[PDB]
Each structure stands twice: as structure tokens, then as C-alpha cells.
Amino acid sequence: DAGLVAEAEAVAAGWMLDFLCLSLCRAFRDGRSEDFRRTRNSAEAIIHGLSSLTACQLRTIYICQFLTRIAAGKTQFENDERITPLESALMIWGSIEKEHDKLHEEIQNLIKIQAIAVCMENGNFKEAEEVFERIFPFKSKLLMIISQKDTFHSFFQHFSYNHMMEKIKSYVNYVLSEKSSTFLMKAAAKVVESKR
């Protein structure tokens, strides 16, 4: 019966999804770019094998999508979405992990500023202004900074790329702890500990 076989494949896809999310979180925290890139490709492919997702599975795929956009922050996509990777992460973030309001607002604001600053860092001030117009007295100060190419303004040092990465890594630690007990990781660790 391919009903029973199809159901077992859906159960296994769900397990593979959690395993790849946990692996993606670890690679992001560790700074292992090539590993992150490979795990991301695997998660994206496995996600195609699922056509119906539970509330928990939706949150999992969106954390994977959010981290993928954060990792591409300083890098076709702009032709399709007409926005920068960090603007996409901001849109994804706006619908996930809202219940920790304090840290959610902190991460949101760091991404908003960095979506502008990464364009300035790359020498594209016209793009930095286009990003500002899509996201946003406070605005007049931010516009003057972009106009004057004031990349190292004190505001940008408090709302830095490193600070954005640090806050996101602290959030990643909660996801990594929450998913550390998923089926495939526990079974994988039991085999490694037995050898050993």
C-alpha cells in the first residue's frame, strides 16, 4: 500500500527536517560557511518532499529561511524579489519568534539598520538610500548619514553587523537547545557514543 509507504516517507521527511534545522543552527553559530551552505541545500530539497506542514514544521522552515537570508546579508534574488537579502530576513522575522518581544524588537532593529549599512560598506550608496526608502527627525538623521557616506557614524557602531550577528546567535542557541532532543539527532548520538 503506497498510502502506508507515503505516510512513512512523510514521517521520515519530518525527522530529516528537524535534523537539518538543528545542523543549520549549529553551522550558523559556529561560522562554518561551507557546512551551512550544504545543510541549507539539503534542507531546501527535503522541504520539497512535504506538501502539508504542521504549525511546528512551518516555524522550522521559516527559521531555516531566515538564517539563509541573514547568512547572505553581504552577498538573481534582487531581480526576483526586488529587495536585498536582509530586507527579506526582516519580512520573515516579522512573522516568527514574536512571543519573546524584547529580543524580537532588538533583532528587528539591528537588521533594519544593517540592511542600509551593508550597502554603504559595499560602496553602493544609491542602493543604501533605496533600502532606507523601502524600510522607513530620526529618518532625517539616517538620510543625512547615507547622503554624507558616514559609514562609521557612532549610531552605526551601536547598531553594528557584529551586534546583529551576536543577538541572532543568542536566539539560535534557544532553537538549538529546543531541537537538540529530536529523533534523528538522539539516535545518531547513541550510535556514536556506543562506539566511543
Ligand X SMILES: Cc1ccccc1-n1cc(C(=O)O)nn1
How many other CB atoms are there within 10 angstroms of residue 133's CB atom? 10
Single-letter amino acid code for the residue at 50 = L
* 187 scored as a contact of a copy of itself (CB under 8 A): yes
- Report how many helices (DSSP H) and strands (DSSP E) the chain contains, helices first: 11, 0
Region from 57-65, 78-86, 118-126, 179-187 binding a copy of itself, contact rule CB under 8 A: 179-187
Smallest distance, Å, CB 77 to ligand X? 9
Q: In the stretch 36-55, what mask flags binding to a copy of itself with x, by CB under 8 A?
A: --xx-xx-xxx-xx------
Single-letter amino acid code for the residue at 90 = L
Q: Which residues bind ligand X (CB under 6 A)?
A: 44, 48, 65, 68-69, 109, 112-113
Region from 3-11, 76-84, 86-94, 157-165 binding a copy of itself, contact rule CB under 8 A: 3-11
Smallest distance, Å, CB 124 to ligand X? 20
Q: Are 109 and 86 in contact (CB under 8 A)?
A: no
* 9 scored as a contact of a copy of itself (CB under 8 A): yes
How many other CB atoms are there within 10 angstroms of residue 43's CB atom? 22
d(CA 77, CA 69): 11
Q: Is 19 exposed, middle or buried (0-12, 13-18, 19+ CB in 10 A)?
A: buried
* 185 scored as a contact of a copy of itself (CB under 8 A): yes
Pick between residue 108 and residue 124 the one whose CB is nearest to ligand X: 108
Smallest distance, Å, CB 113 to ligand X? 5
| Half-sphere exposure (Cβ direction) of 124: Cα atoms closer than 13 Å | 13
Q: How far apart are the first and last CA of the chain?
A: 40
Q: Using CB under 8 A, list all residues that contact a copy of itself.
A: 2, 4-5, 7-9, 11-12, 15-16, 19, 23, 26, 30, 38-39, 41-42, 44-46, 48-49, 183-185, 187-189, 191-193
